[PDB]
Amino acid sequence: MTIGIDKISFFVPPYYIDMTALAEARNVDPGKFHIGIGQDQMAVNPISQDIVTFAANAAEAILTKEDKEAIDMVIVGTESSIDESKAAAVVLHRLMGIQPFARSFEIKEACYGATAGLQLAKNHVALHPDKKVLVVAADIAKYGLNSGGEPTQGAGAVAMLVASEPRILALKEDNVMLTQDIYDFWRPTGHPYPMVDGPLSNETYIQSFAQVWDEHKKRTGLDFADYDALAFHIPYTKMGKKALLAKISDQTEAEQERILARYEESIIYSRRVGNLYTGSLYLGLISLLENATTLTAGNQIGLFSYGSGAVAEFFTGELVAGYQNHLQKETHLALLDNRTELSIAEYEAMFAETLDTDIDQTLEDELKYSISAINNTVRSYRN
Amino acid sequence: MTIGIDKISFFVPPYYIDMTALAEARNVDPGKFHIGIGQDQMAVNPISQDIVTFAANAAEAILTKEDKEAIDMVIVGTESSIDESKAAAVVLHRLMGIQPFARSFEIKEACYGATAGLQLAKNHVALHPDKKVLVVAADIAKYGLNSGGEPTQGAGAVAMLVASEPRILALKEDNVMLTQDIYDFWRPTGHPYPMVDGPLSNETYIQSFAQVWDEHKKRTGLDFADYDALAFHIPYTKMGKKALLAKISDQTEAEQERILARYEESIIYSRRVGNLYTGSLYLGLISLLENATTLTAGNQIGLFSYGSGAVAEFFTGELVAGYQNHLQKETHLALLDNRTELSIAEYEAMFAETLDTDIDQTLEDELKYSISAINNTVRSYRN
């Protein structure tokens, strides 16, 4: 029995700011964002939209009644939580109408959370093939106006229906994971914005990939030639390209052109969204599935998942025969095309606004699953 | 292949306050805490001791060099986190000296976290029998001085080595889990103390046990008579007794006496510690193993795990032949008996004190793994 991703979909807010507008507002050369970071459009979200808002819309795009009855585990991976005790997965479970006898919880490990949930979900289904697990990555990435990280900001969520005899991606058991206590990025309790050691984040991300890849090659003998495509967690485009470059230098010129071509295909939707933290890698994978014209059934996909602090893991997935018929390109393309472009002024009004959870209030937002009210610090959602 | 808990241990801070002292200082009848709540001594911890401090001491009590090399996953369950991104499991992985190639993350679902980690660990080992997983519950439960929940406070951690062919407890596949979005207890980001609906927390905990127990009975046909002992998560002693009572009303007078007698044996250590949230149920299981003179190999043990907001799950375990030779009774007792009793004036000074993570400073504390210093919000530990 094969196990893996049966359905996948992402969701992003109805708002975005174009990088050239940002460059100009920050008195720099449009090129620095388009050509340095490798970013074009950033996702922007108002206070009435949180991780439940995204996780709910994303999963609502792939769940059927039969899925609601088979799912016995819901997992949310995020490093943008709203409660320190109650898991957002409990509210996702209610809003999605999933049957009651299920286990729900949140997993926290920087941008690596959703990968953890997915592998644990793979194990669960492998042991109970009739059951399914909903693994959703949801995050909001803010660094601060005029911040060093500002151009790498993003927001959204990616939902995965994990089952046996999957229709899109059958996961293998070649996992190589690594844990290292490094303070490249962190956020002490109480800190709205993360603490960032930029250079350390850079080196650690590039090195973690090297170490994990080498071990995997050492344990499985598989090299770049053996992979049709590679999907990466990335805080921004140019980063995964630098990590990719550093490792493929000794491959043939043609082999390098092929791997980079495929990397470029994996970051199409990301260049229009930004960092989704836990869902970054998954957004890359969705991209590869919907935009990569030369992939086909049977091809091998390498996945490098990273989490600051730092955790990292490399694993493989195989294209399932007929996968091309169970994607959501369209809804994904409409989703992106239909967003409203905020001017820098609008964008800043939206970014700086706070949601004071202690104050009772009502919020208006047309988006389904967005926050409708707050009473005694409890959020209500507009379903 | 049986899979389960091979070794377990708990750790609590070196101090405590007598519940009679608390009642007198709070102008309340000693018996309200002693009988009402069913608590005798509360675990108190200073600022220099956090979730890492406990999780490390606990695990250090059961890890061998061989265990450090076989463990490929480290999981910490808590609702007392110190970082919103980086999982305490990463620091625990470093302090414990576990081999590098491991997956490390934190799980958040109120007091249900560690139970999630144990089950997923079970799955992992079932699939990779030569591997072991370290699952540790670590939490600090504070409600505030002169709080309604004050007498139910606690602090500590319980560590579990999950492996195949376990020496203490072999886990069955009879799990009945449940998820319900209810605000009985939660803690919005930014809130040092939880928001608590007492009556709702009460009814929800009792009703969850009922619903879960009935379902397990409907699916397996097993009733109370079939169990040699039951272990419960409990915010306090009298709670699990009230939940136990509401469900065993129609059993024989002799059956009720036996189940209660066994329940009383599960709460011996808890009456001297208080609420460990995630590790509460596990502290009860350790108590049963170390205090229950009549238990023996092959006896069945049902465990009821509850986490606020609210998830619950009922599963069973069987005592493995020779389990009596792989427990830590002396160390545990030595841990409880050798603690320093604080006067209420001392307890109040400890409790209120805060750790300003933003201020770089040093900290002196004799406990191994307590915080030694803070620099740029990064905690260093005394190893």
Coordinates of N, CA and C in Angstrom, one line a residue, chain B residues 67-150:
Chain B
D67 N 20.5 4.6 24.3 CA 19.2 5.3 23.9 C 19.5 6.6 23.1
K68 N 20.6 7.3 23.5 CA 20.9 8.5 22.7 C 21.2 8.4 21.2
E69 N 21.6 7.2 20.9 CA 21.9 6.8 19.5 C 20.8 6.2 18.7
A70 N 19.8 5.6 19.4 CA 18.7 5.0 18.7 C 17.5 5.9 18.5
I71 N 17.4 7.0 19.4 CA 16.3 7.9 19.3 C 16.4 8.8 18.1
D72 N 15.4 8.8 17.2 CA 15.5 9.6 16.0 C 14.3 10.6 16.0
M73 N 13.7 10.8 17.1 CA 12.6 11.8 17.3 C 12.5 12.3 18.7
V74 N 12.4 13.6 18.9 CA 12.3 14.1 20.3 C 11.1 15.0 20.2
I75 N 10.1 14.7 21.1 CA 8.9 15.4 21.2 C 8.6 16.0 22.6
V76 N 8.3 17.3 22.6 CA 7.9 17.9 23.9 C 6.5 18.4 23.8
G77 N 5.7 18.0 24.8 CA 4.3 18.4 24.9 C 4.2 19.4 26.0
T78 N 3.7 20.6 25.6 CA 3.5 21.6 26.6 C 2.5 22.7 26.2
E79 N 2.1 23.5 27.2 CA 1.2 24.6 26.9 C 1.8 25.7 27.7
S80 N 3.1 25.5 28.1 CA 3.9 26.4 28.9 C 5.2 26.8 28.1
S81 N 5.0 27.0 26.7 CA 6.2 27.4 25.9 C 6.9 28.7 26.2
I82 N 8.1 28.8 25.7 CA 9.0 30.0 25.9 C 9.4 30.6 24.6
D83 N 9.0 30.0 23.5 CA 9.3 30.6 22.2 C 8.1 30.2 21.3
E84 N 7.7 31.1 20.4 CA 6.5 30.9 19.6 C 6.9 30.2 18.3
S85 N 8.2 30.1 18.1 CA 8.7 29.4 16.9 C 9.6 28.2 17.1
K86 N 10.6 28.4 18.0 CA 11.5 27.3 18.2 C 11.0 26.4 19.3
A87 N 11.0 25.1 19.0 CA 10.5 24.1 19.9 C 11.6 23.8 21.0
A88 N 11.1 23.6 22.2 CA 11.9 23.3 23.4 C 12.6 21.9 23.1
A89 N 12.1 21.1 22.2 CA 12.6 19.8 21.9 C 14.0 20.0 21.3
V90 N 14.3 21.1 20.6 CA 15.6 21.3 20.0 C 16.7 21.5 21.1
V91 N 16.3 22.2 22.2 CA 17.3 22.5 23.2 C 17.4 21.1 24.0
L92 N 16.3 20.4 24.2 CA 16.3 19.2 25.0 C 17.2 18.3 24.2
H93 N 17.1 18.2 22.8 CA 17.9 17.3 22.0 C 19.4 17.7 22.2
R94 N 19.8 18.9 22.4 CA 21.2 19.3 22.6 C 21.7 18.9 24.0
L95 N 20.9 19.3 25.0 CA 21.3 19.0 26.4 C 21.4 17.5 26.7
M96 N 20.5 16.7 26.0 CA 20.5 15.3 26.2 C 21.5 14.5 25.4
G97 N 22.2 15.2 24.5 CA 23.2 14.5 23.7 C 22.8 13.4 22.7
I98 N 21.6 13.6 22.2 CA 21.0 12.7 21.3 C 21.7 12.8 19.9
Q99 N 21.8 11.7 19.1 CA 22.5 11.7 17.9 C 21.8 12.8 17.0
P100 N 22.7 13.5 16.2 CA 22.1 14.5 15.3 C 21.0 14.3 14.3
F101 N 20.9 13.1 13.7 CA 19.9 12.9 12.8 C 18.6 12.5 13.3
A102 N 17.9 13.5 13.9 CA 16.6 13.3 14.5 C 15.7 14.4 14.3
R103 N 14.4 14.1 14.4 CA 13.3 15.1 14.1 C 13.0 15.6 15.5
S104 N 12.8 16.9 15.7 CA 12.5 17.5 17.0 C 11.5 18.5 16.9
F105 N 10.4 18.5 17.7 CA 9.3 19.5 17.6 C 8.5 19.5 18.9
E106 N 7.7 20.6 19.0 CA 6.8 20.7 20.2 C 5.4 20.5 19.7
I107 N 4.6 20.0 20.6 CA 3.2 19.7 20.3 C 2.3 20.5 21.3
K108 N 1.4 21.3 20.8 CA 0.5 22.0 21.6 C -1.0 21.8 21.5
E109 N -1.5 21.2 22.6 CA -3.0 21.0 22.6 C -3.2 20.9 24.1
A110 N -3.2 22.0 24.8 CA -3.4 22.1 26.3 C -2.7 20.9 27.0
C111 N -3.4 20.2 27.9 CA -2.7 19.1 28.6 C -2.7 17.8 27.8
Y112 N -3.2 17.8 26.6 CA -3.2 16.6 25.7 C -2.0 16.3 24.9
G113 N -1.2 17.4 24.7 CA 0.1 17.3 24.0 C 1.0 16.1 24.0
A114 N 1.3 15.7 25.2 CA 2.3 14.6 25.5 C 1.6 13.3 25.0
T115 N 0.2 13.2 25.2 CA -0.5 12.0 24.8 C -0.4 11.9 23.2
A116 N -0.5 13.1 22.6 CA -0.4 13.1 21.1 C 1.0 12.5 20.7
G117 N 2.0 13.1 21.3 CA 3.4 12.6 21.1 C 3.7 11.2 21.3
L118 N 3.0 10.6 22.3 CA 3.2 9.2 22.7 C 2.6 8.3 21.6
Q119 N 1.4 8.6 21.2 CA 0.7 7.8 20.1 C 1.4 7.8 18.8
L120 N 1.9 9.0 18.4 CA 2.5 9.2 17.1 C 3.9 8.5 17.3
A121 N 4.5 8.6 18.4 CA 5.8 7.9 18.7 C 5.5 6.4 18.5
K122 N 4.5 5.9 19.1 CA 4.1 4.5 19.0 C 4.1 4.1 17.5
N123 N 3.3 4.9 16.7 CA 3.3 4.6 15.2 C 4.7 4.6 14.6
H124 N 5.5 5.6 14.9 CA 6.8 5.6 14.4 C 7.7 4.4 14.7
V125 N 7.7 3.9 15.9 CA 8.4 2.7 16.3 C 7.8 1.5 15.7
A126 N 6.5 1.5 15.5 CA 5.8 0.3 14.9 C 6.4 0.1 13.5
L127 N 6.6 1.3 12.8 CA 7.1 1.2 11.4 C 8.7 1.1 11.4
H128 N 9.4 1.6 12.4 CA 10.8 1.5 12.4 C 11.2 1.0 13.8
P129 N 10.9 -0.3 14.0 CA 11.2 -1.0 15.3 C 12.6 -0.9 16.0
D130 N 13.6 -0.5 15.2 CA 14.9 -0.5 15.8 C 15.1 1.0 16.3
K131 N 14.2 1.9 16.1 CA 14.3 3.2 16.6 C 13.5 3.5 17.8
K132 N 13.9 4.5 18.5 CA 13.3 4.9 19.7 C 12.9 6.4 19.6
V133 N 11.9 6.8 20.4 CA 11.4 8.2 20.4 C 11.3 8.7 21.8
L134 N 11.8 9.9 22.0 CA 11.7 10.4 23.4 C 10.5 11.4 23.4
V135 N 9.5 11.1 24.3 CA 8.4 12.0 24.4 C 8.3 12.5 25.9
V136 N 8.4 13.8 26.0 CA 8.4 14.4 27.4 C 7.3 15.5 27.6
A137 N 6.6 15.4 28.7 CA 5.5 16.4 28.9 C 6.2 17.3 29.9
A138 N 6.1 18.6 29.7 CA 6.7 19.6 30.6 C 5.8 20.8 30.7
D139 N 5.4 21.2 31.9 CA 4.6 22.3 32.1 C 4.7 23.0 33.4
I140 N 4.3 24.3 33.4 CA 4.3 25.0 34.7 C 2.9 25.6 34.7
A141 N 2.1 25.2 35.7 CA 0.8 25.6 35.9 C 0.5 26.7 37.0
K142 N 0.4 27.9 36.5 CA 0.1 29.0 37.4 C -1.2 29.7 37.1
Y143 N -1.9 30.1 38.1 CA -3.2 30.8 37.8 C -3.2 32.2 38.4
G144 N -2.4 32.4 39.4 CA -2.2 33.7 40.1 C -2.4 33.6 41.6
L145 N -1.8 34.5 42.3 CA -1.9 34.5 43.8 C -3.4 34.9 44.0
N146 N -4.0 34.2 45.0 CA -5.4 34.5 45.4 C -6.4 34.2 44.2
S147 N -6.0 33.3 43.4 CA -6.8 32.9 42.2 C -7.7 31.7 42.6
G148 N -8.7 31.5 41.7 CA -9.7 30.5 42.0 C -8.8 29.2 41.8
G149 N -8.0 29.1 40.7 CA -7.2 28.0 40.5 C -5.9 27.8 41.3
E150 N -5.5 28.8 42.0 CA -4.3 28.7 42.9 C -4.0 27.4 43.6

